[PDB]
């Protein structure tokens, strides 16, 4: 499948979930990995990204201070720690990869990623 997410669940607002993504496809020192999400009815939106080599991160404003994106290169893994969950966080969460061979900056992309997982479903109640 190349990318496989896990860790979705039903949670109560104020709780926490940790999403995981294993990247079976080919990785490189110029990759970015990220997380996107799609709330029911709405369009897909960027959540967070990390440069695979440098570890520079970026977040959408509505998750700052609450979500953290990390990686483990030896496990071909990327993680999204989600704390202080809010009903507006309810969505399908997708892991994604982008190869950026011509990049000249470690800041990761927030759009136009090469491929996507099937998604992991997150519902935040109350």
């Amino acid at each position: 499948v190349q990318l496989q997410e896990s860790g979705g669940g039903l949670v109560q607002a104020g709780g926490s979930l940790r999403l995981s993504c294993t990247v079976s496809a080919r990785t490189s020192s110029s990759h970015d990995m990220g997380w996107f999400r799609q709330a029911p009815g709405k369009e897909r939106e960027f959540v967070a990204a990390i440069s695979w080599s440098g570890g520079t991160t970026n977040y959408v404003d509505s998750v700052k201070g609450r979500f953290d994106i990390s990686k483990d290169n030896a496990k071909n893994a990327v993680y999204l720690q989600m704390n202080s969950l809010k009903p507006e966080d309810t969505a399908v969460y997708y892991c994604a990869a982008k190869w950026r061979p011509l990049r000249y900056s470690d800041n990761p992309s927030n759009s136009d990623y090469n491929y996507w997982g099937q998604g992991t479903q997150v519902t935040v109640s109350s």
Partner: peptide, 12 residues
């Protein structure tokens, strides 16, 4: 807009 290398014609 987009990544800095796509706003330019970039190549090796």
């Amino acid at each position: 807009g987009g990544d800095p290398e796509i706003v330019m014609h970039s190549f090796n």
